[PDB]
Design a binder for this molecule. Sequence first.
Ligand SMILES: [Cu+2]
Ligand SMILES: [Zn+2]
Ligand SMILES: [Zn+2]
Lengths: 211, 386, 242, 242
Amino acid sequence: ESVVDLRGMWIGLAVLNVFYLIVRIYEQVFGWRAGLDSFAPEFQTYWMSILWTEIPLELVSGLGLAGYLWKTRDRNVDAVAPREEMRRLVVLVQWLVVYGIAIYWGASFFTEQDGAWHMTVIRDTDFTPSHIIEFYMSYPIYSVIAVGAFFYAKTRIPYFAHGYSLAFLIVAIGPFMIIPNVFGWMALGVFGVVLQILGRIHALIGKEGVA
Amino acid sequence: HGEKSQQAFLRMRTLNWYDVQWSKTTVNVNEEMILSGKVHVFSAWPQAVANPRVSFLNAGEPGPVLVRTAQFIGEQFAPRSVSLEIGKDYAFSINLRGRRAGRWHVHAQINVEGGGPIIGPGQWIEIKGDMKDFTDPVTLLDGSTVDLENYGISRIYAWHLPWLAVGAAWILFWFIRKGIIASYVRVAEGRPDDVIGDDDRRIGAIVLALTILATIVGYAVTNSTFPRTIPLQAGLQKPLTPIETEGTVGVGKEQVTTELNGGVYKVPGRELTINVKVKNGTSQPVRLGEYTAAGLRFLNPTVFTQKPDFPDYLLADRGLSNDDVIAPGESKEIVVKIQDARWDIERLSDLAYDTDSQVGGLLFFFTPDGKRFAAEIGGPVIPKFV
Amino acid sequence: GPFNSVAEAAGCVATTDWMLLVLLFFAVLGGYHVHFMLTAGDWDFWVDWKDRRMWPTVLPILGVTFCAASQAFWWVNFRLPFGAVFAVLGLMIGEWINRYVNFWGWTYFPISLVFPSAMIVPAIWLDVILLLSGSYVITAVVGSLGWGLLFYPNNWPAIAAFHQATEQHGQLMTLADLIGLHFVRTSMPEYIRMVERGTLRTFGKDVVPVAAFFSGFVSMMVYFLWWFMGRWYSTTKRIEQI
Amino acid sequence: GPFNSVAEAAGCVATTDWMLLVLLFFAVLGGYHVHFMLTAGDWDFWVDWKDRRMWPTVLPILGVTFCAASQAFWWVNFRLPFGAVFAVLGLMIGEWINRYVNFWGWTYFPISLVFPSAMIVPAIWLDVILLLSGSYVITAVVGSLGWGLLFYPNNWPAIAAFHQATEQHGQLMTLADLIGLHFVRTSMPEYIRMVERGTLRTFGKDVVPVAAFFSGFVSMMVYFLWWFMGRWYSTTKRIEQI
Ligand SMILES: [Cu+2]
Ligand SMILES: [Zn+2]
Ligand SMILES: [Zn+2]
């Protein structure tokens, strides 16, 4: 045993961060001489190929990940040893870190990236290379990852099972309320989520003069 | 690019682009060219589009591949927004200056305030050289010259980066001097106070007092460099001057006039046939030379025997015809046949999709000598299916 | 604990501490950035939108939102005095990375045209007013007033070089206006702007000072509201039904 | 029971059941109709208001309101999966009785001018999405997205006949435009309408699809809000003072 692992995290982090880097290099190259005129055949082969492909892949990956965490759920969750709970909830915190990164790329990088592209074209279509990446890839991805985080918590930690964390809810569902054109109700309930984890870390030790 | 996807009737019945030319199609980094032309604001300006009272000239282009060095319209340097008057004509020009190597579609463009972009004709410009070589530059009032490409930028980082750093150090400091979990626990248990108490406050009182000092200093320092500064200069410009030459829709003793009397356009999708009631208010026999729509030129090969410098795309050598010098003072109704693939390709044929099934544009009539006399055409046209 | 030694206990605490800081930092960055981007725009994107009236008004007011929520989370639950700066720096980083890697790196707009608003300084004021008086009420007032006032000055050193004057074909322009005209944006006609254009009801000479005081006073309200927002986003409630 | 037999108990349950179904139907009809009439108007009243952009936007959004509250009542307290269809049918009936008995029967406007918007189909999607996943949250999202999307196509069969083209005095008109011009209303000048009139910011060809999606996404929010409204209207609280 080791309560702290982290391999899973680094795998998810390298696989996610290289992927986006490939996507950014891909748009630097095929942004020009492929993505400026959506009427051209190059738009079909280089841009719509991504869109038509990613939507189903993300939808299958979403349902496939939920379905898997559920089938493999802990049917004996109330029986979990203090140590194994401590491990399961370090894994939650792993999920949430990957989701932190996912949210950065999706909501910061690729969203404001759309800002500069709006000043580049006059738009043939709703599906600009910017949007294809931002709305149809970048956002679904952290949406999926968020649902995973939630599902993992519901199926492995007694607390997140029998309940629905209201804060975790807002986190998993909030994304499905992002819509642009054409103040404040946002996802930021990770605040609640980490307080519930801390609530739970606190309780997994009675002899805490050591901190 | 993209204009192909804007609604036909809007393209047709807002700006009627003509005499658009591009001075050089090929330029090195740092080399100028002028993009110039004329524009007639259509008199039946659509309701969908706010009044062109409040407008802006522009180079449609994919980012700053060429740098705009000045532009003019009306008869006026126009870095700010201008007023076009319904049913009048305006000359414009843009001076552009090569910046990124490649091959690029540079249109004339005008945006109207509650309107959107209206995209004039474009041409491919090859820009060759190395973007590293690009310079402006630009003369300040105090006599100096700056290179706008680079100017001011490190002064921004010199201020932005340090603070972003002081930013992080404030976070790391607290995180590390008594941490996250350790702090959650203390607060949740007994009181904090084991988390914060002077000298923790002293640190903050200090840091703040430095921060405001650094803020004052940086302020008084930047007023010493740069002691005379103006606020951004914004606002609509005095009314423009229209083209009075010579001419030229609704100007001078000599006019041509063109009432549209119904028309038919096949869906789909290459032909438009129109009845035009022409009045020759000139003193010379005139033949119809040209229909122009949305940038597009439909030429009469009888008049344009051969055969102008103009973009691909765009230039259609069939807007036939019927040859019969319309006579001076005469008043005649002629059947005009706009045929060419370019109608379908630039999606004017998608008129059948619009909430207003109606053409606009200009007709050009020519004397036996040079003179071109211009008339606005526009009105209801009916689709004929398959 | 549920730990094999004291070494495993300490090693876990320190590394969950890192993961939490990093996940919280990028969580807030996303929320804050989308919100801000969609509102404060526009004025943050473009040098020639940074006037004496609009910008130093809309920005402090839309920007204080997530600082207050972040203070609410960090102060109430940990007594950590970096909620404002945490949020603000996040915004800065999210913005800067983008302006450099994309506005410039993708689309070749020079950084003089697209540099962000400077916010760390007021963010600090905000954080230490909360530290010195563990009262959100005193902060919501005197803290966020300072947040307002401080905005313009802390931007002035990045901004002033662009407010030097040029003459271009007979007509005065700032360098900002000029960087605007020069580096052609396809959809930024000078009129979509929303910068100060003069009024008959201005007396002075006082344009920036009143905009500063205005943004201070209005931020107080926004700060009060968003503090509580932070509290509600901090909720540890379970619900039973969906 | 307080019943003399089991026959009296059964007879009571069955006939109080009817009475409750009939009082609830007509109670919901009343509220829904007044609300809808005052907001969705206007687009519902007139065939020449049923355009590609406004109608398939305002209608699903304003129409989802009472469907959500009705689901909030019927599902939470009884697990009956007809809250939407219940509301929606009521609206249709209230509407159709009026168009036939009054718009036509009293004021002689032909039914092709005054027929209501088709809504049963999206109402069904809404109800069975709630039935398959006893979740209002999943319904608020996917249910009410399908509500939006389904609106236009379920209207198309009733609407399309009137989008055939006619030439009148050298100018194109739809039959719907014609029915509007012909059957003179005293206070319906073409311009009070609020239908699509074109824009420079439309690309395609895509007018109905984006209206459909827009309505789906906006309805989610309205659905969320109106669910909880249905909850609060469900209140069994007594208050003690007036
Ligand atoms: Cu082009
Ligand atoms: Zn259980
Ligand atoms: Zn250089």
